[PDB]
């Protein structure tokens with residue numbers, strides 16, 4: 001239903017590990033999009049065949065402004081290619097790098113658009129992890145936009161998932177707190193230079209605020225960063241927490 005002969009590829013958008021991401025244009029409409037290459041070399045040794053071809057079917061029928069649209073996919077002999085929305089202002093990762101820290105307005109706005117994008121996913125009975133700043137792209141209007149749903153680096157994982165317990169959708173409200181902290185402070189709250197330390201930090205939820213973090217964020221962050229899932233606010237509440245409303249954008 002789609003082949004590489006339909007696209008002229010262009011500039012590399014990003015690269016590394018299992019394949020590459022190229023900007024490209026669909027010939028018969030001149031549509032600008034993004035192609036993800038996989039090589040399938042990692043399909044073996046990860047056995048992640050059907051993997052995504054399953055996640056592909058899931059995401060491909062999701063639709064929302066703060067979620068990066070996936071269009072289709074196709075089999076090369078060697079490579080596997082994904083066809084995604086192209087996001088003109090790149091990752092939040094790069095911008096966090098460029099700016100070091102975010103102000104409360106940009107932080108609380110991103111947090112809003114994220115909170116909305118998740119409740120929609122919950123409503124389609126979709127839960128997950130990631131939401132690492134490398135997986136948040138920016139639309140032409142600066143709107144946040146969630147990349148994919150798929151050891152690892154640990155620091156966005158919640159205590160219940162790393163203790164090996166069971167996890168529901170409340171995983172995503174951990175994540176929200178983690179990012180809102182990273183967005184305000186420049187680094188994630190349980191960062192370490194060791195997988196083993198970070199692991200400790202996360203399971204004991206040990207974080208401290210630098211002084212410049214205001215009380216309204218300390219509050220929101222705190223409420224999201226609790227070892228006990230059932231004690232994390234509901235998305236509905238997050239969207240309406242004063243500091244959000246006070247600082248968020250229209």
Ligand SMILES: *Cc1cc(-c2c[nH]c3ncnc(N4CCOCC4)c23)ccc1O
Pocket residue numbers: 013014015021034036068084085086087088090091134135137147148
């Ligand atoms: C698989 C994947 C695809 C992208 C992606 C989608 N649209 C983009 N527009 C600009 N840049 C990027 N990336 C890709 C990776 O490095 C540069 C940022 C876009 C994003 C993340 C991802 O996992």
